[PDB]
């Protein structure tokens, strides 16, 4: 449980906090002499829901088109597991959730 190629997967709805955490981790992986791979921009997923405007069934056939973009980024680090987890607490953000896989 020393050095470890560790993958961190980042998913969120908003890109500013995703890129701030991504850049902050990359920045912290720079002053610490840790070789890094990323961030990798995964193809964004557009969750689309198209309903009818009318609560009843009358009028011109008009539709709403709601959207929910999901952006996913993975960053590869070469560091021991204790080091990577404390970086996550440094760059904790309410919007972005974090999962760590070895």
């Amino acid at each position: 449980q020393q050095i470890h190629k560790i993958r961190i997967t980042l998913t969120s709805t908003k890109v500013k906090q995703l890129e701030n955490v991504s850049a902050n981790i990359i920045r912290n992986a720079a002053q610490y002499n840790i070789v890094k791979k990323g961030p990798v921009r995964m193809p964004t997923k557009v969750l689309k829901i198209t309903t009818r405007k009318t609560p009843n069934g009358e009028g011109s056939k008009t539709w709403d088109a709601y959207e929910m973009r999901i952006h996913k980024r993975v960053i590869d680090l070469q560091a021991p597991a204790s080091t990577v987890k404390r970086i996550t607490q440094i760059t904790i953000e309410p919007g972005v959730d974090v999962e760590v896989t070895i």
């Binding site: 998913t11 969120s12 709805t13 997923k45 969750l47 929910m68 999901i70 996913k72």
Partner: peptide
């Protein structure tokens, strides 16, 4: 899944 997890958090 990720699509159904972010939606669940919103709901």
């Amino acid at each position: 899944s990720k699509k159904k997890k972010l939606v669940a958090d919103g709901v």
